[PDB]
Amino acid sequence: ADVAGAVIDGAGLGFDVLKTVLEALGNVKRKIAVGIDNESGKTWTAMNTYFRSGTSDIVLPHKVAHGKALLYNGQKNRGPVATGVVGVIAYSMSDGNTLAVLFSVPYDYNWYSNWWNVRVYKGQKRADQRMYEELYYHRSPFRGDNGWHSRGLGYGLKSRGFMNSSGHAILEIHVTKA
């Protein structure tokens, strides 16, 4: 499938798959399509998504092996309420560690910006408010600046990712052998 909760070939992850993933969400003021290429050489297994704000109806794809990409999405809570969609995704890796990805898509764009983060934690750590705090404040994430950002993760891995500035967000990340 080309759709949300699917695992695909890494080579197949591009803006076009994500664009459609995002439009399938219908018309909502805040939404994000995420995709993550696994080139780490480690096999990833899903733990969870902590939503600080927002929800998703997607089952976080369970098994992403080397060379496969996962597709995900989230939207803001239904109703007039003004909140974005802000979260952290946590996969366990075959090396005994945790890949954690942060995404923040805000409501009030006067005050806030789009942000994303990629970090490797030691051991198996499920995502919680605690981890969101670290990824968003203390770890100096990347602004969705409409630009590509690469940073080393440790553990022989590095991350390459892109995020737009809009409230309909596309986040494309590539984890690769360093």
Curated annotation (Swiss-Prot):
Q: Where does an N-(acyl)-sphingosylphosphocholine 4 bind?
A: Y132, Y137
Phenotype for W148A: In V60E/W149A; decrease in hemolytic activity, suggesting that this mutant forms functional but structurally weak pores
Q: Where on this chain does an N-(acyl)-sphingosylphosphocholine 2 bind?
A: R52, S53, G84, Y107, Y112
Subunit details: Octamer or nonamer in membranes. Monomer in the soluble state.
Q: Which family does it belong to?
A: Belongs to the actinoporin family. Sea anemone subfamily.
Q: What is this protein called?
A: DELTA-actitoxin-Afr1a
Summary of the protein's practical applications: Has been engineered for DNA analysis in nanopore technology.
Binding positions for an N-(acyl)-sphingosylphosphocholine 3? W115, Y136
Subcellular location(s): the record lists: Secreted; Nematocyst; Target cell membrane
Q: Which UniProt keywords apply?
A: Cytolysis, Ion transport, Lipid-binding, Membrane, Nematocyst, Secreted, Target cell membrane, Target membrane, Toxin, Transmembrane, Transport
Q: What is the effect of changing V59E?
A: V60E/W149A; decrease in hemolytic activity, suggesting that this mutant forms functional but structurally weak pores
Residues annotated as site: Part of the hydrophobic cavity (in subunit A) that receives Val-60 from the adjacent subunit (B):
F15, W148, F162
**Quick one: which residues bind N-acetyl-D-glucosamine 6-sulfate?**
Y50, R52, Y137
InterPro entries reported in the protein's UniProt record: Actinoporin_PFT, Anemon_actinoporin-like, Cytolysin/lectin
Q: Which GO terms describe its biological process?
A: cytolysis in another organism; monoatomic cation transport; pore complex assembly
